[PDB]
Amino acid sequence: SLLPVPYTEAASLSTGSTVTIKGRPLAAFLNEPYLQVDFHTEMKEESDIVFHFQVCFGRRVVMNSREYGAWKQQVESKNMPFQDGQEFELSISVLPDKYQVMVNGQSSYTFDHRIKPEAVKMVQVWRDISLTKFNVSY
Amino acid sequence: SLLPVPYTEAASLSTGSTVTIKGRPLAAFLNEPYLQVDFHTEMKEESDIVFHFQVCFGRRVVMNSREYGAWKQQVESKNMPFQDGQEFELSISVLPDKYQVMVNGQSSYTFDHRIKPEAVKMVQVWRDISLTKFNVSY
C-alpha cells in the first residue's frame, strides 16, 4: 500500500519520544510473515542496532541489539496481540529505562536500554508488511 | 533518584506476570513515609483500581480495590519486612487466584483477585519513595 517497504527514516529519540507505525501483514499467519523494526546508530543499514524488534506473526517476538556488528543477548516473548489478517497499530515509546511497545493500545513488550536512545540516527521498518503510517514525535 | 515519582507505566498482566520495584523511603520510619502501588483499569489516574497496596513504613499495610470510584473492603496487615533507612526490593507476582507480594525475597502479603488481572492497563507507584527500578515481565 501507501509507504515504501523497506522503509527507512532518519530519526532522533530521547525520553518522551514515540514511534508510531500502522501496517498490515502481507500474508495469513499460517504462512508466518515477519515484521521487523530496527533503531540504527547510522543511516547505513549495516550500522549497529540499539533496539531490534522482530515479530514472527502468530509465533513469537525476538528482541536484541547489534553492537560492533555482533548480535547480543536475544530476548524472546510468546505474547502475540497481533490479529490474523488485520491492520495493526504499533507504538514504541522511549521511557527513561526502556522501550515500551504498545500493540493496538495494549502494552505488549518492553526492552531495557542497552545503549542511550540518543545514539539512534535512523529507524528501519521492513519484512512482510505493508505500511500506511510512520511517525516520530519531536 | 533515578525514576520520576509519581511513576506511571502502561502495563498488561496475566497469570505468570511479575512487577518488580526497587526503591528507598524518603524519610526515616519515625516520620511514617508511605509507599503506594496501584494497578489501574485505565491510564487515567482516577480510573478504577484492581489492586491497591499502601505501606505506612514501620506501621501497617492496607490493601483494597476501587470499583466504580468507590473503595471496597479494606484488608490490613501489620507485617513489616521493610527495614528503616534501607533500599527495598518489592516483587508482585500474578498467581491464578491472588497477587503475591515479596519483599526482599520473602513472601509478605497476598491479595485474592477481585477482578481479573487482565483488566489492568496501568501501574502507578507513588508517595514518599525514590525509585531506581520498575519492571514488568511480558
Swiss-Prot record, chains A, B:
User: Boundaries of each Galectin domain copy?
Assistant: 5-137
| Gene transcribed to yield this protein | CLC
Q: What SMART domains does this protein map onto?
A: Gal-bind_lectin, GLECT
Where are the annotated coiled coils located? Answer: none
Extract one GO cellular component term from the record.
collagen-containing extracellular matrix
Know the name of this protein?
Galectin-10
Q: Which species is the source of this protein?
A: Homo sapiens (Human)
Q: Which InterPro entries is this protein grouped with?
A: ConA-like_dom_sf, Galectin-like, Galectin_CRD
Residue numbers bearing the N-acetylserine modification: S1
| UniProt cross-references to PROSITE patterns, sorted A to Z | GALECTIN (PS51304)
